[PDB]
Design a binder for this molecule. Structure first.
Ligand SMILES: [Cu+2]
Length: 213
């Protein structure tokens, strides 16, 4: 388990969404290194225009988070490998619509694949999301994780910067069960959103650093 993340690991991400009737598909490819809690990914939409800002999808696209070598006992994500785990989430955007997510994170050879499906409902156009009024960036957050004794689950809020100056919050409720146990801790997350030099498609370059505490 902890064996597989001792070096450089390539990543593959697939996501499928449906927000108020608007469908789309995002393909993600790159590389991650759990030793320093670093992953560099590039996401490409094949349906063209997104009906939803990239920052909101960031949390929906953790086995590469750096756990201190005395807190390896709290790393559930690496213990489930290479069998994998399921990642269920229901993101509650403040004063707007919500997300529903179930992901499949497992090893398919030499790469780690993340199969995701998303559902968006009750979103208001004229809001921060459908109007695309959120800043193309990501703040620092704390992912409080509790243990799921009879087999984990996490809780955290995301602060999306609005172009006007306000902040769009989003409560995240997470549940993880292994496909094939820690005390209450949390993770410190840092993420950078960017674009690439020669890429005329709607995309998102992602560099993220996460460390346990
Ligand atoms: Cu669907």
């Amino acid at each position: 388990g902890e064996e597989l993340f001792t070096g450089v690991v390539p990543i593959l991400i697939e996501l499928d969404g449906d927000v108020n009737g608007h469908k789309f598909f995002v393909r993600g490819e790159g590389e991650g290194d759990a030793t320093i809690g670093k992953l560099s990914l590039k996401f490409i939409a094949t349906t063209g225009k997104l009906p939803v800002p990239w920052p909101t999808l960031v949390t929906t696209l953790q086995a590469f988070s750096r756990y201190p070598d005395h807190m390896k006992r709290h790393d559930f994500f690496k213990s489930a490998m290479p069998e994998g785990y399921v990642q269920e989430r229901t993101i509650y955007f403040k004063d707007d619509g919500t997300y529903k997510t179930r992901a499949e994170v497992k090893f398919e050879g030499d790469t780690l694949v993340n199969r995701i499906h998303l559902h968006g409902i009750d979103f208001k156009e004229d809001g921060n999301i459908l109007g695309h009024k959120l800043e193309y960036n990501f703040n620092s957050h704390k992912v409080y994780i509790t243990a799921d004794k009879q087999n984990i689950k996490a809780n955290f809020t995301i602060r999306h910067n609005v172009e006007d100056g306000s902040v769009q919050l989003a409560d995240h409720y997470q549940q993880n069960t292994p496909i094939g146990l820690p005390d209450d801790h949390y993770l410190s997350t840092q993420t950078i959103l960017s674009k690439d030099l020669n890429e005329k498609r709607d995309h998102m370059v992602l560099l993220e650093y996460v460390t346990a505490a």
